[PDB]
Structure 1
């Protein structure tokens, strides 16, 4: 069921293979209730992840503007204890970052053992906007996708469990959400009219997003998450993360004392 959103290995896909506005037959109220119940489970499993200190989880969120990366971090990553989470929001590369290979700044933020890392935007930006606006060509993009895959294989072998999530919104949904930034004086700061050129290039972005999804493997899957309904985005992401953590199955560590014997004065 959630697995219907997993990009299966070894076959290219089209973003239009998935609807942008699924609800799995649930009411918003039912979905939000389930999300709240999942939050408690996410917290217990993340506490076990940290206590164990042998494994880590890396969620990569990659999506167009207004698709809900920020909201998903707030609502779903907010279920975890913030002491066991590292969030990085990757913005335009600095001069220093540009003077290195494109994974230098990405690798530095990979999570330590016991932690959940979150990448709001990621190494995939280096094969997304860069291709649409012709800063790299297809041969370079192919090389970078291979290097991305090798990087993910390296983290997997380090017991970093990788989950990549594409938040799938329709162009009309994006347009409503952007218009809502223009209409709210508290949100103008968040709206850049120069960014509207990206909408003119919507299909070109589909094209390069579809190539990014080709790094989906059994060990490092991409999920296409219908995100027009923000509550359903949060519900599906909660299941994805909880499924990952249950499969990682981190255990509380052995202790070197007998608790029944301890006397607190």
Structure 2
């Protein structure tokens, strides 16, 4: 497995049909879950360094369709982090006050602080995805919003915020099984709403608008297309993506302004 195969290279447009949805890198579910359990300890060690250093931050942006596994990815992979060094925002429909501001006003407020890991379950890209499929905004407006999103991600990059954007890529048949699974089990009768089905019927248009959203992939702010049909593979690949980012960020523990040998505890 080369994780870089899943990175949208700069300047190269995307046709989601070209990325697989059910990769497994030649591993069994047990071999994958075991490797994920090991990376969890690594993710915890490096997130502590990030927080102790207090110079950098990591922003994970999760975008995916219903039942693709973003809530399940947060619970497993992001759960390896110390919750005191993490901030998770799930952006719902814009409120009245939020609509009275530019579309990035509410997004910028949740940008992560130094030393923290930030996660955007749904993010600023919602304003050029669902807003286009249902013709709330026109193509002219959408392209201009995409330019504003790049400039926004560039601002955070110069602020030492390492941006990582991940798209969870699943097939329609897999979603159908997962959605039917919510309807089948009496305990999950609450993550399904007549409205997930509306977006599903617009599968092909979401392919197009996502392909547009993915053109923001740069060296400093990359998009990753993660085959998510196998939940354990989603978790494993996301673990590799975040750990490699933290290792490249290479946080160091902070200096001290005292001589430990001269300290006498009374």
* TM-score, reference length from structure 1: 0.98
Instruction: Work out the CA distance in 2 between the residues paired with 1:34 and 1:255.
Output: 36
CA offsets per residue over residues 46-67 of structure 1, 9 Å max, x none?
Answer: 1110110000000000000100
Shift of 1:263: 5.0
Q: Which residue of 2 aligns with 1:14?
A: 15
**Unaligned runs of at least 5 residues, structure 2:** none
Instruction: Work out the CA distance in 1 between the residues paired with 2:36 and 2:264.
Output: 40
Q: Which residue of 1 aligns with 2:218?
A: 217
Moved more, 182-191 or 22-31: 182-191
Q: Report the 3-state secondary structure (helix = DSSP H, G, I; strand = E; otherwise coil) of the residue aligned with 2:195.
A: helix
**Residue-pair matches, total:** 265
Shift of 1:143: 0.3
Q: Report the 3-state secondary structure (helix = DSSP H, G, I; strand = E; otherwise coil) of the residue aligned with 2:9.
A: coil
Instruction: Work out the CA distance in 2 between the residues paired with 1:170 and 1:32.
Output: 22
Shift of 1:21: 0.5
CA offsets per residue over residues 5-49 of structure 1, 9 Å max, x none?
Answer: 000000101111111010100111111111111111111111110
Instruction: Work out the CA distance in 1 between the residues paired with 2:25 and 2:264.
Output: 52
Q: Report the 3-state secondary structure (helix = DSSP H, G, I; strand = E; otherwise coil) of the residue aligned with 1:22.
A: coil
Shift of 1:264: 4.8
Moved more, 82-91 or 251-260: 251-260
CA offsets per residue over residues 84-108 of structure 1, 9 Å max, x none?
Answer: 0000010111111111100000000
Shift of 1:256: 2.4
Shift of 1:257: 3.1
Q: Which residue of 1 aligns with 2:250?
A: 249
Shift of 1:194: 3.0
Instruction: Work out the CA distance in 1 between the residues paired with 2:62 and 2:227.
Output: 13
* TM-score, reference length from structure 2: 0.97
CA offsets per residue over residues 176-232 of structure 1, 9 Å max, x none?
Answer: 111111111222222112331111110000000000000000000000000010010
CA offsets per residue over residues 114-147 of structure 1, 9 Å max, x none?
Answer: 0000000000000001100111111111000000
Q: Report the 3-state secondary structure (helix = DSSP H, G, I; strand = E; otherwise coil) of the residue aligned with 1:167.
A: strand
Q: Report the 3-state secondary structure (helix = DSSP H, G, I; strand = E; otherwise coil) of the residue aligned with 2:111.
A: coil
Shift of 1:254: 1.1
Q: Which residue of 2 aligns with 1:167?
A: 168
Shift of 1:259: 4.0
Q: Which residue of 2 aligns with 1:33?
A: 34
Instruction: Work out the CA distance in 2 between the residues paired with 1:145 and 1:160.
Output: 19
Moved more, 178-187 or 164-173: 178-187
* Structure 2 residue 183 is matched with structure 1 residue 182: yes
Q: Report the 3-state secondary structure (helix = DSSP H, G, I; strand = E; otherwise coil) of the residue aligned with 1:182.
A: helix
Moved more, 224-233 or 184-193: 184-193
CA RMSD, aligned part only? 1.1
